[PDB]
């Protein structure tokens, strides 16, 4: 239903935009920079405690 | 490798979407390799502060914006009983 | 002269060697490294947040040199109280990083030199 309602009616053709935002995500991707759109998904775990894997960002700053 | 297509205009994410395959394509949708092979990853993340933490998956070929997404493919071209467990597992279910 | 954004990526990496001449510069410009030119953009992140939010080990060196700086600075409010003070993030001390980056090493070290536990 909703992959068909993006598409809108008959007579008018809806404009439909990019989902997500563009973060830059690694250096040498393809150029000097790359740019992907991605999808934040928030997730809580209480098990794991790394702080080993390096993150994109470091100050939080959600939605 | 990955943005390649064959003679019927698919790639590998979306093959394994239209022919029914969701142990490679779950697997393709969320790998996240750490060290040198950090460009071909789609799972980022990234911030963790405590026990939450904000994971950029990836939506190259997996958004309607596409003219033959995975959300098309998944929806209106895949002829298998398999169709909804693509759709449940995650990041499909929050997009 | 002495950039915010030169000190800032000269405490990225934790090199103590580039500090020298800050002293000279921050008496000379009577300024105080508290100041909201020094501060990291709108959030309100100061330096030492920014010290600390990159650890090579569980462990930095260009902490103590900095809070050495700070002290012979002369400034009334002391560097490491200080909050991040904006509408998402407010209040965030130095010592809330290092408690969350599990680094035992920089707790200690922070609250030796005056860090305000509450």
């Known amino acids: 239903s909703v992959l068909e309602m993006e598409n809108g009616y008959w007579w008018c053709r809806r404009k439909k935009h990019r989902e997500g935002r563009l973060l830059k995500v690694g250096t040498r991707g393809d150029g000097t920079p790359d740019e992907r759109w991605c999808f934040r998904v928030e997730e809580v775990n209480w098990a794991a405690w790394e702080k080993t894997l390096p993150t994109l960002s470091e100050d939080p700053s959600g939605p | ?95 | 002269r002495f950039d915010r954004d030169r000190l800032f990526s000269v405490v990225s990496r934790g090199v103590p060697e580039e500090l020298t001449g800050l002293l000279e510069y921050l008496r000379w410009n009577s300024k105080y490294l508290t100041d909201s030119a020094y501060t990291e953009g709108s959030t309100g992140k100061t330096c030492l947040m920014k010290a600390v939010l990159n650890l090579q080990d569980g462990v930095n060196a260009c902490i103590m040199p900095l809070l050495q700086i700070d002290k012979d600075s002369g400034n009334p409010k002391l560097l490491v109280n200080a909050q991040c003070t904006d509408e998402f993030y407010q209040g965030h001390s130095a010592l809330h990083i290092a408690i969350e980056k599990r680094s035992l090493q920089c707790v200690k070290l922070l609250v030796e030199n005056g860090a305000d536990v509450h």
């Open chain 2, 1 to 95: 490798l990955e943005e390649i297509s064959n003679h019927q205009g698919l790639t590998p994410l979306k093959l394994a979407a239209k022919e029914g395959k969701i142990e490679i394509f779950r697997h393709i949708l969320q790998r996240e390799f750490s060290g040198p092979y950090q460009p071909l990853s789609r799972k980022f993340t990234e911030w963790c502060y405590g026990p939450v933490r904000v994971s950029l998956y990836d939506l190259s070929s997996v958004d309607s914006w596409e003219k033959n997404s995975v959300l098309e493919i998944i929806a209106f071209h895949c002829k298998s009983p398999n169709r909804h467990r693509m759709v449940v597992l995650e990041p499909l279910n929050k997009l």
